Ligand binder design. Structure first.
Ligand code: GDP
Ligand code: MG
Length: 169
């Protein structure tokens, strides 16, 4: 039979984790989705000829107990590490997410895709080079997205599944 993959969407508050996830799941852009809600969604997709089931956790940051964060990192098979291209702090936070996920999984090889979201907005502060360089330093893909226009959205999630498949192989 087919396989279910656990994908985890991480990043600073307001970078567009929820907007990206809802676009993938429901095919519309949600302007106002409570920043404090953490939920998961299932979606069956075909990627490279193989059907699979995505179980996507849209994270919202601190948990009641940090042990709960550690648990979703341990069970998570691939991570979408999202920053917003107009928020340098959210980009610098990626260093922390990369470290923390590796630390919790006690692994040097964790499937991830770096996502620079809000690419439809003006006055970018994080340039493509910075982000491309960081992703290269991690050995992972970098994709620029807009949850509003859908630029790169499917690409980001499907690329993450490909990265999970490569890790498991
Ligand atoms: N213009 C634009 N706004 C976005 C995009 N992604 C998210 N937003 C907005 O940015 C804010 C934060 O989005 P949200 O999905 O709630 O971020 P989260 O806290 O990471 O889940 C919201 O007001 C969204 O409308 C995007 O790609 N483009
Ligand atoms: Mg959210």
């Amino acid at each position: 039979g087919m396989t279910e993959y656990k994908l985890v969407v991480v990043g600073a508050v307001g970078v567009g984790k929820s907007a990206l996830t809802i676009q993938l799941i429901q095919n519309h852009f949600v302007d106002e989705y409570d920043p404090t809600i953490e939920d998961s969604y299932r979606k069956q997709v075909v990627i490279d000829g193989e059907t699979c089931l995505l179980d996507i956790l849209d994270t919202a940051g601190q948990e009641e107990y940090s042990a709960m964060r550690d648990q979703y990192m341990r069970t998570g098979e691939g991570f979408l590490c999202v920053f917003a291209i107009n928020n340098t702090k959210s980009f610098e936070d990626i260093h922390h997410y990369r470290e923390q996920i590796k630390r919790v999984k006690d692994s040097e090889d964790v499937p991830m895709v770096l996502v620079g979201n809000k690419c439809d907005l003006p006055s970018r502060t994080v340039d493509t080079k910075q982000a491309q360089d960081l992703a290269r330093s991690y050995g992972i893909p970098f994709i620029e997205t807009s949850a509003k226009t859908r630029q790169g959205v499917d690409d980001a999630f499907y690329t993450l599944v490909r990265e999970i498949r490569k890790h498991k192989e």
